[PDB]
Write a protein that binds this ligand. Structure first.
Ligand code: HEM
Ligand code: HEM
Ligand SMILES: C[C@]12CC[C@H]3[C@@H](CCC4=CC(=O)CC[C@@]43C)[C@@H]1CC[C@@H]2O
Ligand SMILES: C[C@]12CC[C@H]3[C@@H](CCC4=CC(=O)CC[C@@]43C)[C@@H]1CC[C@@H]2O
Ligand SMILES: *[C@@H]1O[C@H](CO)[C@@H](O)[C@H](O)[C@H]1NC(C)=O
Ligand SMILES: *[C@@H]1O[C@H](CO)[C@@H](O)[C@H](O)[C@H]1NC(C)=O
Ligand SMILES: *[C@@H]1O[C@H](CO)[C@@H](O)[C@H](O)[C@H]1NC(C)=O
Ligand SMILES: *[C@@H]1O[C@H](CO)[C@@H](O)[C@H](O)[C@H]1NC(C)=O
Ligand SMILES: [Mg+2]
Ligand SMILES: [Mg+2]
Lengths: 240, 240
């Protein structure tokens, strides 16, 4: 029971904190999280993710508390803090550049081209297109970034993020692992819920049981292999 | 402001949650944290560690948020949750057994013997004794624990914990990196502030600048070296 008319999209202003995550950015841009993107807690993320997307607490508590590590504060972050490389933020993003060779924070259209051009001849993105995109994005990083980090952990996060856009921006049952291109494109390009375009919050809860087989299938189809030491160590706090 | 006389030691009851950390347990046993050891946030830890020990927010925010990962809750833990092996809890503890070959949670006198017998002929523990104890405890784990984990991360946490007992249970300036045996022994064995015995909260702030060189010196004197997997990966949540 949520009124989205009470949660209009507004462009972030100059001092509004935004991060590398289109999911949290979009929530902020609709006031499900504070529009200023600051002093955000895990409880706020849980509630916002539920209200906006029908994403459940299981994934948001797990991801949320890892994200809290990126700030210097006891129990909040600014959305921009999440750019901290090697906590959650990773190389071979769908819409951002690798931190060693560019901007790991802002939407980048040239990077997004690979996703935007995926699944030619359908009007949806799906599990096989998502996997191909992941394969191609990793190949790009391996080719152009000598400092690329690619581990079981980064690969899992990446597949989770692909599963997120397929499910949250779905038309049908998020189970189907497919989302209209016109919805997903608005999500990434404008960090807006495509309400005008016909999108509605899922009526099916999106949780780890639902996401898990989608994640695993994306990974499997992506023809993935580790790089280097394959160490799943995260950065535990900023400025260590 | 803070009145220690209003914070008497009381033994935990059977349903009071206690963890592998004598620092947090002691605070709970004095009501600086909830005596039941539950529903504890990073802000609560920050305030309790300041009031009880003069430990500053820098280290408590960093450690606190890593510890939050051990629970299934959005922003709190039970003290017992911190026993989760491979988040913070590690092998070659000073006063607990390795989880693969015993109890990683409760104080164990036989394990503590090594610490208790360190620095023979002085009435203090100090940086060189702390280092010897760490060397000997790791040797014990390598000898007796087929599942031993020893990484740069576990070694650093271990030196941090040793620096904690040398500083928080100090008589003089915590700078000196030495603490009376009679204070440290009560701290570990009873998880009590040794007020009766003459201990007072440090009047010098204990923060990362103060602890850093003590930690590094303990590590250096401990003659530590990597032994296998040196991947400093933490466990990101329970039930994975
Ligand atoms: C609530 C639903 C969520 C959705 C739908 C979502 C969606 C996404 C998507 C699609 C990406 C990939 C962007 C890209 O590769 O360019 C992403 C990245 C990210 N998300 Fe989320 N997210 C959500 C929740 C969260 C939470 C709770 C956190 C942390 C508290 C988080 C932190 C991040 C971070 C740090 C990245 C950067 C990874 C990278 O691309 O390097 N997200 N998110
Ligand atoms: C955020 C705050 C804290 C958290 C989350 C935390 C957590 C932990 C955990 C999980 C352990 C078990 C490590 C192991 O031995 O396997 C531990 C050990 C320890 N902690 Fe804490 N701690 C905190 C603050 C403090 C403080 C303020 C002190 C001050 C005295 C302290 C002193 C110790 C000591 C001495 C040990 C070693 C126990 C042993 O090796 O037997 N801790 N801590
Ligand atoms: C929550 C998270 C995305 C989802 C990941 C999680 C790591 C563990 C994990 C394993 C799986 O098999 C499913 C996805 C999950 C549940 C990641 C840690 C940080 C990241 O944002
Ligand atoms: C906070 C912490 C103790 C202090 C550690 C920190 C890891 C990084 C670190 C490196 C140092 O050189 C000093 C101690 C510190 C700052 C640890 C992570 C978990 C543990 O409780
Ligand atoms: C994705 O769509 C393409 C084209 O419509 C199709 O060939 C492919 O089999 C689909 N994959 C999945 C997983 O449904
Ligand atoms: C935990 O603490 C919060 C914050 O004070 C409170 O609202 C809540 O009721 C508590 N939960 C339990 C289980 O007591
Ligand atoms: C620790 O105490 C012993 C015995 O008093 C002494 O010989 C040693 O030098 C001390 N070490 C440090 C670092 O103070
Ligand atoms: C611990 O070591 C034993 C002996 O090598 C091995 O059989 C077992 O799988 C290990 N356990 C874990 C937790 O890996
Ligand atoms: Mg990235
Ligand atoms: Mg231990």
């Amino acid at each position: 029971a949520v009124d989205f008319s009470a949660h209009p999209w507004k462009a972030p202003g100059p001092n509004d904190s935004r991060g590398p995550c289109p999911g949290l950015n979009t929530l902020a841009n609709h006031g499900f999280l504070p529009r200023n993107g600051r002093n955000i807690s895990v409880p706020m993320i849980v509630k916002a993710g539920f209200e906006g997307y029908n994403v459940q607490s299981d994934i948001l508590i797990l991801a949320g508390k890892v994200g809290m590590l990126t700030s210097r504060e006891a129990d909040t972050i600014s959305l921009e803090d999440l750019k901290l490389h090697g906590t959650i933020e990773h190389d071979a993003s769908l819409s951002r550049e690798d931190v060693a060779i560019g901007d790991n924070l802002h939407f980048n259209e040239a990077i997004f081209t690979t996703l935007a051009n995926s699944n030619p001849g359908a009007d949806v993105y799906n599990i096989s297109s998502a996997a191909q995109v992941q394969h191609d994005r990793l190949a790009d990083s391996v080719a152009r970034n000598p400092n690329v980090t690619n581990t079981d952990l980064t690969a899992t996060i990446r597949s989770s993020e692909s599963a997120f856009y397929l499910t949250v921006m779905s038309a049908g049952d998020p189970l189907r692992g497919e989302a209209p291109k016109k919805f997903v494109n608005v999500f990434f390009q404008e960090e807006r819920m495509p309400i005008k375009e016909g999108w509605k919050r899922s009526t099916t809860p999106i949780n780890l049981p639902l996401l898990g087989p989608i994640i695993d299938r994306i990974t499997e189809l992506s023809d993935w292999k580790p790089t280097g030491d394959n160490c799943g160590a995260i950065v535990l706090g900023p400025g260590l």
